[PDB]
């Protein structure tokens, strides 16, 4: 097992996700992978009124031994076309997953923050340059491409 603080935090946070209004709306979900709690599987719904609407995105979530004092490591398993996520690896550019993690944050707020990122790209500080360039230079074709990928990869 992990340290008591980490185990108790993760169990509490799993309960929080289960009991949340957002899971009742089918917006977020977290499931077990191990017999332990070092890897979890997240899922988020594409926010409404975005190219990701209708899609569901699986997330690889790795909990460090130092939880809650360092962030989970999170990657998109489900491929997505977004300026702040690698279209190749699913790697995520988001401050709360690096220098702006706070110990008060939770699995629930991480999932909800990732949804919010889907609704509010920051192309000037990108993860994927090709995607970010298209977002800026041809937003109509960015939208068509992201929608297509939501159908192709995310069940939209």
Using alpha carbons, select from 131, 111, 112, 130 the residue that is nearest to residue 121.
131
39: Cβ contacts below 8 Å, ≥ 6 apart: 33, 60, 61, 62, 63
144: Cβ contacts below 8 Å, ≥ 6 apart: none
Domain boundary assignment for the chain: 1-156
Q: Does residue 89 sit in helix, strand or coil?
A: coil
Q: Which tokens sit at 143?
A: 């939208």
Alpha carbon distance 45, 155 (integer Å): 10
Alpha carbon distance 69, 133 (integer Å): 35
Alpha carbon distance 133, 124 (integer Å): 9
To one decimal, the resolution in angstroms is 1.8
The reply to whether 93 belongs to the active site is yes
154: Cβ contacts below 8 Å, ≥ 6 apart: 46, 52, 54, 55, 56, 57, 78, 79, 80
Using alpha carbons, select from 56, 67, 131, 63 the residue that is nearest to residue 93.
131
Pair type for strands 39-45 and 28-32: antiparallel
Using alpha carbons, select from 16, 39, 5 the residue that is nearest to residue 107.
16
| Experimental technique of record | X-ray
C-alpha distances (whole Å) from 64 to each of 29, 53, 101, 140 are 20, 31, 13, 40
Alpha carbon distance 75, 89 (integer Å): 8
Q: Which of 28, 44, 61, 93 is catalytic?
A: 93
CATH superfamily of 1-156: Ubiquitin Conjugating Enzyme (3.10.110.10)
Q: Which residue has the tokens 């989970």?
A: 72
For CA atoms 38, 5, 64, 24, the dihedral sign is positive
């Amino acid at each position: 097992a992990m340290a008591n603080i980490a185990v108790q935090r993760i169990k509490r946070e799993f309960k929080e996700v289960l009991k949340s209004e957002e899971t009742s709306k089918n917006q977020i979900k977290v499931d077990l992978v191990d017999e332990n709690f070092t890897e979890l599987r997240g899922e988020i719904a594409g926010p409404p009124d975005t190219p990701y609407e209708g899609g569901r995105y699986q997330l690889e979530i790795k909990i460090p031994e130092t939880y809650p004092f360092n962030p989970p490591k999170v990657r998109f398993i489900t491929k997505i076309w977004h300026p702040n996520i690698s279209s190749v690896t699913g790697a995520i550019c988001l401050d709360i997953l690096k220098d702006q993690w706070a110990a008060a944050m939770t699995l629930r707020t991480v999932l909800l923050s990732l949804q919010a990122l889907l609704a509010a790209a920051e192309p000037d500080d990108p993860q994927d340059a090709v995607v970010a360039n298209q977002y800026k230079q041809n937003p109509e074709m960015f939208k068509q491409t992201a929608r297509l990928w939501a159908h192709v990869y995310a069940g939209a």
